[PDB]
UniProtKB/Swiss-Prot annotation:
Disulfide bonds join C10-C45, C20-C36, C115-C197, C160-C174, C171-C182, C228-C242, C348-C380, C358-C371, C405-C680, C421-C643, C454-C530, C478-C671, C488-C502, C499-C513, C570-C584. PROSITE patterns: TRANSFERRIN_LIKE_1, TRANSFERRIN_LIKE_2, TRANSFERRIN_LIKE_3, TRANSFERRIN_LIKE_4. This is Ovotransferrin. Belongs to the transferrin family. It comes from the Eukaryota. It holds the Pfam family Transferrin. Residues 7-333, 345-670 form the Transferrin-like domain. Monomer. Its main location: secreted.
Length: 686
């Protein structure tokens, strides 16, 4: 994006300043130049960027946290990347290691012996302790002038918490003398130390990082375990699904309301003229043969290989993820201890209307569920990723995204009050997507390029998303238009070949290509007629043939129509009888489901099953409020929802959606991803 601006990098050390001007010298010659301002505290720097003296700095997981807090809401615009065998990464993970065979899981740390890395260390203090604070377990609430932080003594019978000088049982298990055992360097300190402690039977849990079991014990790793927050243990290598939280990489941060593009543009050029391989000398990351301590990690970590940009919708809170953010809430902010799941659900709504209905919900449930409001589905997910909201009913599409953002399906919407409902329920009954055609057994799926297709409307499942998704799987281009010769896809941009055949209102002038019933070929029906007047391939749902053909639609285009006139295009290449669906289909698009974070999952489940007994299709109080009836239509649930099918514990979105739909969407979305899927993709790393 175009300028000739300087960028004021901030340094807090002279050494740092040293390479900062070394940097600038290398490219006085470019559009976006650099400036160096040194200060004493990262923190000053923070405020020196909130007041516009400066432009960017590289923060640490916890630093970047407070840089985000008002009055400076500086946001991470760029993070580092670090791997060797694997590829690349924007993270590391703290674990709680236990010994295999001792049989306690996370509720049971009350009165354990613990081994830690040091006081005020993220891995060994902040994460575990703050977690255990938010859950309840360590009961710390309101430090105004309440004796405080080292209350963990009341929780754990003994510990080894290095460099603590405020208690004594926390110093108890430290190996050494007495004066040196609780020193910050007292030998059970740091990572390895905390591990040895545990190996010395001096703990029950060493709160550490993942690599440690390989680092200290690669022989006997198999004797050790992880203690996860869902109340389970998992082996050493299952860390990615068992971490207490992943101190997401070092972030360059800057102002929201500013010239960030310029800074990323400098970091960009710099990043790799003078990169990981500089043909010669100024390095921007240069890490070896143990250099002097004050030399290393100036400006960026030397470990770094790569500076990757942050998706613009990202904020401190999202980047750091949940886990860490809330751990830092706990100790870094107030004493907050009897509410992990404060047994009562913030349902997150879209649009005032939705709110109104949720307000009804609120009331009649006697406040079991409370309500938040937004302007978007986009947004409600973020309030769910951020723990400001709990659950939302999502569409098949939305589900994928949220599922990528780690929201798991809970109850799926079923629309037949007669089929899948309790015992009755097996999985909720989706509908199909199928490409219908006529006689000419010339046409097949893999030969479809360049034919004339008719589509329901763009942005719709049936007519647009599934065919085009699948098709893009095959092509690798976001070419849409330029795949078929021409066809109809309502609301296409009128120069688009997929507006060529559209007839608008009959053919009297008016609305040649609108996605509305003021267009001749709109909807499933319109498109079935569109196979009939002009198109070669129709993309629709499986009920469309058998809803208009043999004396079902009495419009003149349809008058002589009967089902052997239309066949199904199978994906495998073959064709079939319209009347033959579960076997021949493009995709079986599942219902809406509600998603939340895994933690909220099983209670959400209960909420609704209760709420339904009272306000669903044969509810106890349904005269006050019908959970499923709306003042308009799809207000919270899909108006002609019948019952709420329980999906079994920990369902993957992928399972819920099935391989066909999952493939459709995933491919369609490599084309032009939205802001939210982008971030959820970056934090699939997290």
């Amino acid at each position: 994006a175009p300028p000739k601006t300087t960028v004021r990098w901030c340094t807090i050390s002279s050494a740092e300043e040293k390479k900062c001007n070394s940097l600038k010298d290398h490219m006085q010659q470019e559009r976006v130049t650099l400036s160096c301002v040194q200060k004493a505290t990262y923190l000053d720097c923070i405020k020196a960027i909130s007041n516009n003296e400066a432009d960017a700095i590289s923060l640490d997981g916890g630093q970047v946290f407070e840089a985000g807090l008002a009055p400076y809401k500086l946001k991470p615009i760029a993070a580092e990347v670090y791997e060797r065998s694997g590829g690349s990464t924007t993270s590391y993970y703290a674990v709680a290691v236990v010994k295999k065979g001792t049989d306690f899981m996370i509720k049971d740390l009350r009165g354990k012996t613990s081994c830690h890395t040091g006081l005020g260390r993220s891995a060994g203090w902040n994460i575990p302790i703050g977690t255990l604070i938010h859950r309840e377990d360590i009961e710390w609430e309101g430090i105004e002038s309440g004796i405080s932080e080292q209350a963990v003594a009341k929780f754990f019978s003994a510990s080894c918490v290095p460099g603590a000088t405020i208690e004594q049982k926390l110093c108890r298990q430290c190996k050494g003398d007495a004066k040196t055992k609780c020193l910050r360097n007292g030998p059970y300190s740091g990572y390895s130390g905390a591990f040895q402690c545990l190996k010395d039977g001096k703990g029950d849990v060493a709160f550490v990082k993942h690599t440690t079991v390989q680092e200290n014990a690669p022989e006997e790793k198999d004797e050790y375990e992880l203690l996860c927050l869902d109340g389970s243990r998992q082996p050493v290598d299952s860390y990615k699904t068992c971490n207490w939280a992943r101190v997401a990489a070092h972030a360059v941060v800057a102002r929201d309301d500013s010239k960030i593009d310029d800074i990323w543009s400098f970091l960009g050029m710099q990043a790799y003229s003078l990169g990981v391989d500089t043909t010669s000398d100024f390095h921007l990351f240069g890490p070896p043969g143990k250099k002097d301590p004050v030399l290393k990690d100036l400006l960026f970590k030397d470990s770094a290989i790569m500076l990757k940009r942050v998706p613009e919708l990202m904020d401190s809170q999202l980047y750091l993820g949940f886990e860490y953010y809330s751990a830092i809430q706990s100790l870094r902010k107030d004493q907050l201890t009897v509410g992990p799941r404060e047994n009562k659900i913030q349902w997150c709504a879209v649009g005032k209307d939705e709110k109104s209905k949720c307000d009804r919900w609120s009331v009649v449930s006697n406040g079991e569920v409370e309500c938040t409001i937004l302007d978007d589905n986009k947004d409600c997910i973020v309030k769910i990723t951020k723990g400001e909201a709990d659950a939302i009913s999502l569409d098949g599409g939305f589900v994928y995204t949220a599922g990528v953002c780690g929201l798991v399906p809970v109850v799926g919407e079923s629309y037949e009050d007669e089929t899948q409902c309790s015992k009755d329920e097996e999985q909720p009954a989706y509908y199909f997507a199928v490409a219908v055609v006529k006689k000419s057994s010339a046409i097949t799926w893999n030969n479809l390029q360049g034919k004339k297709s008719c589509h329901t409307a763009v942005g719709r499942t049936a007519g647009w998303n599934i065919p085009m998704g699948l098709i893009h799987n095959k092509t690798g281009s976001c070419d849409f238009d330029d795949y078929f010769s021409e066809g109809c896809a309502p609301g296409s941009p009128p120069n688009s070949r997929l507006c060529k055949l559209c007839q608008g209102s009959g053919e009297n002038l008016l609305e040649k290509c609108v996605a509305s019933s003021h267009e001749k070929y709109y909807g499933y029906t319109g498109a079935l007629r569109c196979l009939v007047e002009q198109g070669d391939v129709a993309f629709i749902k499986h009920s469309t043939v058998g809803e208009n053909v043999s004396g079902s639609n009495k419009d003149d285009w349809a008058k002589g129509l009967t089902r052997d006139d239309f066949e199904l295009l199978c994906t495998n290449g073959k064709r079939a009888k319209t009347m033959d669906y579960k076997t021949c289909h493009l995709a079986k698009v599942p219902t809406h489901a509600v998603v939340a974070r895994p933690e909220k999952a099983n209670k959400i489940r209960e909420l609704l099953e209760g709420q339904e007994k009272l306000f669903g299709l044969h509810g106890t109080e349904k005269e006050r409020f019908m959970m499923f009836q709306s003042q308009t239509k799809d207000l919270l649930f899909k108006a002609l929802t019948k019952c709420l099918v329980k999906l079994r514990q920990g369902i993957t979105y992928k399972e819920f959606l099935g391989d066909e739909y999952y493939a459709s969407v995933a491919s369609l979305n490599t084309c032009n991803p939205s802001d939210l899927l982008q971030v959820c993709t970056f934090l699939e790393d997290k």
